[PDB]
Chain A
Amino acid sequence: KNFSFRIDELEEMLTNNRIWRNRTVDIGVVTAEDALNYGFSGVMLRGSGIQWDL
């Protein structure tokens, strides 16, 4: 019951922070075909845009 507020506070410090976005945006971009061939799974695929979840 009390955990969504913790996630919200975590997002208040990072999600729209311009320093966080400069550090994380367009860093370590992996294409979907490369992810599948390299054998990535989970959030790696889903960040590349692959609609897969066991």
Chain B
Amino acid sequence: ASKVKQDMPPPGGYGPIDYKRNLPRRGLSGYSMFAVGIGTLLFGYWSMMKWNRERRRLQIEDFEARIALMP
């Protein structure tokens, strides 16, 4: 009492197979990206402004010490 056994799909078939493209958006807006860039530029400019003014004062102090020693 043996029945035919063969490679067949299961009853009801197989599940759906995805084949469509699935490239998502996954990104901010151009406006927001440009805003972030401008903001970091401005923060950097402000920090460099203060630091370079301080460096100019330090250079003036060193030059004054040299002038005092020069004679």
Instruction: For A15, give the chain B residue with the smallest CB separation.
Output: B23
Q: How far is the CA of A16 from the CA of B24 in the complex (A)?
A: 12
Q: Distance in Å from the Cβ of B55 to the closest Cβ of chain A?
A: 41
Chain A min CB distance to B50 (Å): 39
Instruction: Summarize A's interface: helix, strand, loop or mixed.
Output: helix
Contact: B21 with A11, CB < 8 Å? yes
- Contacts between chains A and B (CB distance < 8 A), count: 18
Chain A interface bracket (under 10, 10 to 19, 20 to 34, 35 or more): under 10
Q: Evaluate contact between A1 and B20: CB separation under 8 angstroms.
A: no
Interface size on B, residues (CB 8 A): 8
Judge whether B22 and A8 touch: CB under 8 Å: yes
Chain B contacts of A8 at CB under 8 A?
Answer: 21-23
A37 on interface, CB distance cutoff 8 Å:
no
**Contact of B23 with A1 in the complex, beta carbons under 8 Å:** no
Flag whether B19 is at the interface (Cβ < 8 A): yes
* B17 close to A (CB within 8 Å): yes
Assembled-state Cα–Cα distance A31/B21 (Å): 28
Q: Is A4 an interface residue (CB 8 A)?
A: yes
3 A-B pairs with least C-beta separation? A4-B18, A8-B22, A4-B19
